[model samples]
Target: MTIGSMENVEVFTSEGKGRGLKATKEFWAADVIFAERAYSAVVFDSLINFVCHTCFKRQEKLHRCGQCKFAHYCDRTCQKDAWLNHKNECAAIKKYGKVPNENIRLAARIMWRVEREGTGLTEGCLVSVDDLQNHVEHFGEEEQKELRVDVDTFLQYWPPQSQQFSMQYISHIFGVINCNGFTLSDQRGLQAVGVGIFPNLGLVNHDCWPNCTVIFNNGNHEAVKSMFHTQMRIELRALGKISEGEELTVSYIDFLHLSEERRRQLKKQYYFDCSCEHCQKGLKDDLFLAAKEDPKPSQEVVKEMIQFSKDTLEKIDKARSEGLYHEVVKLCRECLEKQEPVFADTNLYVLRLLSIASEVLSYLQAYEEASHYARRMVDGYMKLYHHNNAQLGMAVMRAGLTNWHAGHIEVGHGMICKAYAILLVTHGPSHPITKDLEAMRMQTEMELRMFRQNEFMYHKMREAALNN
Candidate 1:
């Protein structure tokens, strides 16, 4: 297997499964690793069951092909853009579209949309819930209420078609969803294609004590400019330095509990009981008392731990709502301490904790410690998740900031470059995170040059003084 680059992982096609990746080498922390394009794309209705291939946006009013009445889209532009990915597959879908069960056909159609239209929200894609709330709050109460209702309705009744699809078909559909969404699906023991790389993100696996963090770049685009024109490319990025030979991983579930809960989720979703080094060692000593039992015995214990973690995370949310930043950090740290053993390094919650900790440390002017934790997060993420994974990009950027705060210009600049690479792939150039990374890169370069020039001048002055 090739050591670095997107070519690192070997892809194989077989019956029952379409494509998969095999480790090329022992990847180390924070490596720029593994990338793949999706085989197809599709679009979805707002929440009913379709996704757009070009933008990965969900829609409500969907237009299906009259000929097949299976594939659908939101508009002509999407339809046209989808043709690029669909041309070859569309014929196949039409010829073989008939399923024994109508619900299966419906589910297959939905799966097609997810493959084509689903965009990875990654850390940099959408605005955070809090930010969304703030945006609504800035509007008049009526407007805010209207917006809330719209979102609430979307969330409440979206994906209604899933109800019609059989559990087996639903599980299959969810497999594709999980692949595209970078989250775990546990309704069944089946594993979906790992995260979507081009459409979603190639599954990066999961690990606790991850080396990366993901951030959102909530930027607006004019309809015309952002359409799936040839120029517009969706991007994902790794935000930290990754060494070769590390397996790129992302936490599939929330990592806020002791090992038992972590194992339970992993077993449920990935179908394997993770006995990773961290789980074997760290969880036993941590809060949930995960080390005390066998895999089966520990399952129940892990469930309870998960509940506790959820409760704690809820408290963190409450604290953040109350603007209690300090309390939020405290709660997050507690969650992390319990979580680190069970989660893959790039798990969302663990990354959030790393981000939160870095933020808190920075605010307190603990630059050294902030940089340390930030670096750890970046490295851990790179080891488990790919460069284009959104979470990795965000973590790298945060690490860069921490490095800058700690006066480590060289390291900071390196991280900025790393973050930029992933952002370029995941969010494209126009994304907010992309813009920020660009700006930071420019600033770091200028500052580094200034420092170099000043140092040179100081050396010359010292020689002159000595000679005099």
Candidate 2:
């Protein structure tokens, strides 16, 4: 429940870096060190229909706020509760007759809350402008031009009467967001929903492979299901062992990419070079091929697959963008059916298709069908990546859940436990992600025991009847 406070971490400066957070004590995996809420937040317009404005819970039915035509609520209480935050947004809506984009809305929220509170905004009342890095000076001239447009958009529509509104402060807020904002995503921590800033989390540096993972959690189940993103604080947990004095880091981008590609992205986006252990190991000749190539697929097939998969993937992405889940499922199946004959089980394109089909089917509630694809996803990961890889563990977790829902309880039990073991090493035993699996394992074991007892009683009663 604490915000802005961490148990074993302290802020300090490092060589070439302005400010960073480091552990003061050893942390085992899954250990949560800190939790913090966004300084300002806005649900993206795309999700405006998906979640409630007050609790951020997902529901089929929602009432429109009477004041502003924007924002929906599950009930009257929720509508009333959210009015405190929505009131200013409503006023802005009333005045401008338009809702700003996500980035501008968040910037406006920061100014709105600060002036409303009449105090400086800080993390646990600790972080200040000095604590946050704003890489505004590092931006290329081209990037600045886009930001200039964003700057003008905010200036035009932000509440005019708010005492704290100013171009200089808004620009600084914009700076922090550009340099430090984390892309908030859907429930699984895999997809992008919007953006948010936590001053404390902003201090944590980037690693190509990181020791910590941050997952957003809400108090409600539907809230987690909703694509609207945040209801409360983001949780940061240890993904691996961390000794005292080690810097806490999280991957700013996907670590699945090759080293040079990762470095190019970091330099362009975060404005830094990463020389972490994984980065060094990633560049090694052996590991490079191991991470990127499948030895089983021939060069000719892969070359053709390169073009074929790319074109199909682009079309599939367009389907997703259009919210055509059924079409996405069909396209993924067709693509996989084509690739299955040419590509080996280890091929990346095969894995990608398996993953897409699995996810879209799950989204459509075809858990029986989803279980088959999820099984292949886990198998594909195990063949292509190390058995203990975090992604493999995630795949196994999916297989476990899908099987359980499909009534293959024994198979589901085994897969879930297998996932837990993989996660225990890759994610540490104490992380929140494993807790769900642990509970499932215990519940499944109990159900099996009860079934065995019932079977034994039925057999004994039948024997007695035969003797009589």
| Model 2, position 77: C-alpha lDDT score | 68
| Candidate 1 structure quality by residue, lDDT tens digits, 1-468 | 111134554444423223333345544333334322233323222222354344444446767756555556667766686676555345544555531222222234444444444522323222111111112223456644544443333233234432233344334343343334332111111222112223323434456544433322222334555332223232223434444444444455644445677888776555556666667785433322333222333565556656766688778778778878788777867887776555544454555567777877787788987897798678766755444566566668878988987999989999988888776755556555567689989999998898789999999999999994
Model 2 is weakest, by summed lDDT over 10 consecutive residues, at: 284-293
Q: Best candidate, TM-score-wise?
A: 2
Tens digits of per-residue lDDT for model 2, 1-468: 355566678888888866778998988776767777677656677887676655555567888877777888778867776677778888887898887877788777777777776655463744753237888888889878877888898877876677745666777778877887766654343545566667778778887667887765533333334232223567677876889999888778765556787889999998988888767776432332322334455767657765798789989999999999999999988888777656655556666777888888988889888888888777766754544456678778888888888877777888988988877765444344666678888987776677678889999999999994
On lDDT, the candidate that comes out on top is: 2
What is the Cα-based lDDT of residue 147 in candidate 2?
79
TM-scores for every candidate against the unseen true structure: 0.43, 0.77
Count residue pairs with overlapping backbones in model 2: 3
**Candidate 1: residue 186 Cα off by (Å):** 25
Q: Which pairs clash inside model 2?
A: 29-428, 30-430, 30-431
Q: Which stretches of candidate 2 lie over 4 Å from their true place?
A: 74-84, 117-126, 129-131, 138-142, 164-166, 185-194, 220-231, 283-308, 315-347, 361-370, 382-394, 405-407, 417-468
